[PDB]
Amino acid sequence: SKMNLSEEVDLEDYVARPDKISGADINSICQESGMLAVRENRYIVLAKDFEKAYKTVIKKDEQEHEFY
């Protein structure tokens, strides 16, 4: 929201999928991912930009189903 709706982000981008990662991703990484909407091929940001932002600089940690 700081960058007004990620500089006019599209509707079909919601963070519900790329936030419920349980992969740390400190607020600094969150700000970096927000600024990784710098893909200026278009004037709007899509869910692909967020997916690439989460894909870069990340460590694979998963498997909560055993604990639950």
Partner: protein
């Protein structure tokens, strides 16, 4: 919507108010009609307050804007085109043509009056540089208004 309302009243910046109003309208997408109407009205009011009516045409041509189109929405579009023309008279004409639709004191009448003062000040300042001393009825003739109102505005600016 309330956050955009507060920021719009703060008047330091209106783009964040635009973001909040759009989010509120997005929440009100064909769910609560009166709240959706208020949210889009506030969104378009702050958009024209950004002095960028060029994106107004695209915003009102959007699918949701057409879905929630109304007389008040058309009045705001006419206000936006008045801001395009930089005609304080046209803005006043649009306000009179839809008065009860935009007579709301909370962040509707107040912001329209503030914008009207902005066009008055901009028109006066834009036409005043050449003149070291100009007769005020000539100034009123250029601005296409009466004498008392132009004199009152020029005073309130200079006091």
């Amino acid at each position: 919507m309330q956050s955009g309302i507060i920021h719009a009243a703060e008047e330091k910046d209106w783009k964040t108010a635009y973001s909040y109003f759009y989010e509120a309208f997005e929440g009100y997408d064909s769910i609560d009609s009166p709240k959706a109407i208020t949210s889009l009205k506030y969104m378009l009011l702050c958009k024209i307050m950004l002095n960028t009516p060029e994106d107004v045409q695209a915003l009102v041509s959007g699918k949701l804007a057409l879905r929630y189109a109304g007389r008040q929405t058309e009045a705001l579009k006419c206000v936006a085109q008045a801001s395009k023309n930089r005609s304080l008279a046209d803005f006043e004409k649009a306000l009179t043509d839809y008065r009860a639709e935009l007579r709301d004191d909370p962040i509707i009448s107040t912001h329209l009056a503030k914008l009207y003062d902005n066009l008055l000040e901009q028109n006066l300042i834009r036409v005043i540089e050449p003149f070291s001393r100009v007769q005020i009825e000539h100034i009123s003739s250029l601005i296409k208004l009466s004498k008392a109102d132009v004199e009152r505005k020029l005073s309130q600016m200079i006091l």
